[PDB]
């Protein structure tokens, strides 16, 4: 599965995005502190890109929040020039995430090293992880 | 005991120590690894008397964190004579213990 077995998710109303910012402690901390009112559900785990990255998987209603807003937030919460990934669940979302990254390039001095890939796998208890990169809202 | 640093003022006047080694744990309360290194540094503080151990919340005192160029937690920084001698990034207690032993 590309979807966690525990997450609240309705295929007929909701969408998914899987986010790596270098530590799921940071990724979860940030979305739950700023956007908790606007997302459906949120689960920490390990994502594989089509070597596992620590990720947060976000279930959301497009009529409540768009992917653009979720990605604009993502590029504000951590340093993506430096571990940094966006895992798309559709081909339409893949090209939109790439578009957003391009738009964010000048603001980060064109050094964004964020990887954009289709989602290959997702786990929760798949039972680095040594440190969390700095997570906070940049201005 | 490990003394928490609350402002840049406390931090500076902790570096002004002399030959005694100064260890600072730069931490985040949300960060799992950073949180779990705490009890380990507490034990090293108990074992190494001649060293003064401190902790600093990077969200609380962002100015010191940015100035010491800490971009990950935990980051244990080691000071002698008010100047950096070495640092260990990430939650490896055995690595941290070595840096203490090697520096006093």
Q: Residue B54: which CATH number?
A: 3.40.30.10
Cβ proximity of B37 and B74 under 8 Å = yes
- Counting the structural domains of chain B, the total is 1
The DSSP string of A27-43 is HHHHHHHHSTTT-SEEE
For an interface test with A, give the residue of B72, B95, B96 to mutate (most A CBs within 10 A). Answer: B72
Spatial CB neighbours of B65, under 8 Å, sequence gap ≥ 6:
A134, B26, B56, B58
| Domain ranges, residue B24 | 1-104
Q: How far apart are CA B87 and CA B99, in angstroms?
A: 8
Locate A78 and state its tokens. 């951590």
Q: C-alpha dihedral over B29, B59, A41, A74, to 10 degrees? A: -140
Q: How far apart are CA B95 and CA B102, in angstroms?
A: 11
Q: What are the backbone angles phi and psi of residue B41, rounded to the nearest 5°? A: -70, -30
For an interface test with B, give the residue of A134, A137, A138, A139 to mutate (most B CBs within 10 A). Answer: A134
Which of 3.30.1060.10, 1.10.10.60, 3.30.390.50, 3.30.420.40 would CATH assign to domain A1-139? 3.30.1060.10
Q: Starting at the edge strand that comes first in sequence, how are the strands of the sheet with B75-80 ordered?
A: B3-5, B51-57, B21-27, B75-80, B83-89
Nearest to A86 by CA among A118, A59, A108: A118
Nearest to A75 by CA among A111, A117, A124, A126: A111
């Amino acid at each position: 599965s590309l979807i966690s077995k525990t997450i609240k998710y309705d295929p007929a109303k909701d969408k998914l995005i899987t986010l790596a910012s270098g530590s799921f402690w940071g990724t979860e901390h940030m979305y739950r502190k700023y956007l908790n009112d606007r997302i459906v559900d949120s689960k920490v785990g390990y994502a594989n890109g089509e070597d596992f990255a620590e990720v947060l998987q976000v279930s959301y209603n497009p009529k409540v929040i768009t992917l653009r807003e979720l990605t604009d937030f993502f590029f504000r919460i951590h340093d993506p020039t430096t571990r940094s990934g966006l895992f798309a669940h559709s081909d339409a979302d893949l090209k939109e995430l790439a578009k957003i990254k391009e738009e964010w390039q000048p603001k980060w001095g064109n050094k964004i090293a964020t990887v954009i890939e289709p989602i290959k796998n997702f786990y929760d208890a798949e039972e680095q992880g040594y440190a969390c990169p700095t997570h906070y809202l940049r201005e | 005991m490990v003394t928490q640093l609350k402002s840049a003022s406390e931090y500076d006047s902790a570096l002004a120590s002399g030959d005694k080694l100064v260890v600072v744990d730069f931490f985040a309360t949300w960060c799992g690894p950073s949180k779990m290194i705490a009890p380990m540094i507490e034990k090293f503080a108990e074992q190494y008397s001649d060293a003064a151990f401190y902790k600093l919340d990077v969200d609380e005192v962002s100015d010191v964190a940015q100035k010491a160029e800490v971009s990950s937690m935990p980051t244990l920084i080691f000071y002698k004579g008010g100047k950096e001698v070495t640092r260990v990034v990430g939650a490896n207690p055995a690595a941290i213990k070595q840096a203490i032993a090697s520096n006093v």
